[PDB]
Amino acid sequence: MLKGFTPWPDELAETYRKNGCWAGETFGDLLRDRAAKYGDRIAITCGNTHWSYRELDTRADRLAAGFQKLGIQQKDRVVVQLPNIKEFFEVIFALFRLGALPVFALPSHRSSEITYFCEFAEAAAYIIPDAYSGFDYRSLARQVQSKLPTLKNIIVAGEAEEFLPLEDLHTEPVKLPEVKSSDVAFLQLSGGSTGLSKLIPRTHDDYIYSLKRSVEVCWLDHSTVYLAALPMAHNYPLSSPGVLGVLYAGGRVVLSPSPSPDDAFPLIEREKVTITALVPPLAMVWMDAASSRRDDLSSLQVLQVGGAKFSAEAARRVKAVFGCTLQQVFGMAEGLVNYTRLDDPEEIIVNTQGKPMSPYDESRVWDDHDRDVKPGETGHLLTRGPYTIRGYYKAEEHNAASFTEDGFYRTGDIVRLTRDGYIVVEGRAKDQINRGGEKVAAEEVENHLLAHPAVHDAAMVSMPDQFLGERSCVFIIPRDEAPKAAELKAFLRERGLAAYKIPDRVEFVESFPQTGVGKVSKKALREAISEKLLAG
Ligand SMILES: Nc1ncnc2c1ncn2[C@@H]1O[C@H](COP(=O)(O)O)[C@@H](O)[C@H]1O
Ligand SMILES: O=C(O)c1cccc(O)c1O
């Protein structure tokens, strides 16, 4: 038992293991296994380089030793902040075999966060690249050390300068400690904003299950060719199905330099990728490029889009722009992940956010009083299952206000279950606009606006107002020449939109504040408009 970990109920645990949900295998067993059923069947691609499963397997073994000689022991936490590169793999499976626990930080993090990540998780090691996307991470490290003189095992992929050169750790394999299929395998990082993040303990059993399923639902096989276009450490592109899921199904993963259609498209054409995943904001740009940039993306088959609702106005265009099957994906690091099945109608794909991936996923839409709302109603989404946590790392306070007494985790999202179980998300309860004592589902108004020839993307945020409590302020990224706020409102009015849903204010910008994985940060936008307001 890892300090801070909250297990599932004894009786419900057995259920899962007995119901073949928990395989009883580790990531060690996983890699050991696959690496031996198809040896040099390419597993990872970066530029011109290639890494056989078997190769990955080896390096892992070797690195594990080097890591162990470094002094890292079972259960030790090791924050890992690497971009989309081959090392990320050897590095995490090596820790997985050592029993160490990675802590998945994103490359966009900095001292404020990394110090917290290190201080909190009581990390025994920090892993970074010499530099990426123009940001030298050793300077960041130097920053963290300054605050954490104790952090003494800084490791670096590429020119390691004064710290520890990741390349020199590999050494002779050795006997490693028994890792139990039920041990916490790593610690993930909770959603973007509300402030500081929460850590998310996952275990070989609960996670790998979330992989085998996703694979089955996404149809991943040896033919699979996934293009990691988002920071892969993020749950979404790490397991839904993500790079790890891909490994599971003996397929091959292609690491892209950045999310830009500039790095991905040529890469898509060249490596002939068949599935990739974008968040909504990035999805718009991908589209815009998929015309104003002819170049063969025909290889593509499935194009995942999650992290936030993919407004109907845009989803409907996948088939036409990328000539493939769109897949809504509404998941979370806490567990539950919903997928529009590659089967079901075009409509279901274009107007819902899917339905749970596991038969054992339980989801209840309660109302402000934890009173199950009526059928098909809109309400607070709670969930519970095989790959859904029962508590955050060391956080008794948050856990009290996030997990019901019976294990249910409230996801803060507001949704309505449909006929077939499929979930149609409205948005985050805290993203709701309580204007003049009226509920305003932002997304709804946004979706309309995307339909305007001069709108590229849009994020409706609420803003203060002493008389109505809150007013509505929409941010618009012009699809060229910034339309007139009056023109947009008139547009909404013509479409028949309810007066109280029309944005009180329109604010034009070139891009929206985002987060680690790249989602728009409505929190951020809120701050923005609130400052402007104060400016007066
Ligand atoms: N497909 C989606 N549609 C609507 N909201 C989503 C979707 N995917 C992810 N999310 C949001 O992202 C959360 C999970 O992690 P985070 O973004 O870190 O708070 C969910 O609870 C949602 O609030
Ligand atoms: O983190 C998320 O919000 C997320 C989005 C899509 C799919 C996932 O698995 C996720 O964890």
UniProtKB/Swiss-Prot annotation:
Main site of residence?
A: cytoplasm
Tell me where in or outside the cell this protein is found.
Answer: Cytoplasm
GO-annotated biological processes: siderophore biosynthetic process
Q: Which GO terms describe its molecular function?
A: 2,3-dihydroxybenzoate--[aryl-carrier protein] ligase; ATP binding
Reaction(s) catalysed (UniProt annotation): 2,3-dihydroxybenzoate + holo-[ACP] + ATP = 2,3-dihydroxybenzoyl-[ACP] + AMP + diphosphate
| Alphabetical keyword list | ATP-binding, Cytoplasm, Ligase, Nucleotide-binding
Lineage top rank: taxon? Bacteria
Q: What protein am I looking at?
A: 2,3-dihydroxybenzoate-AMP ligase
Species, as recorded: Bacillus subtilis (strain 168)
Taxonomic lineage of this organism?
Answer: Bacteria, Bacillati, Bacillota, Bacilli, Bacillales
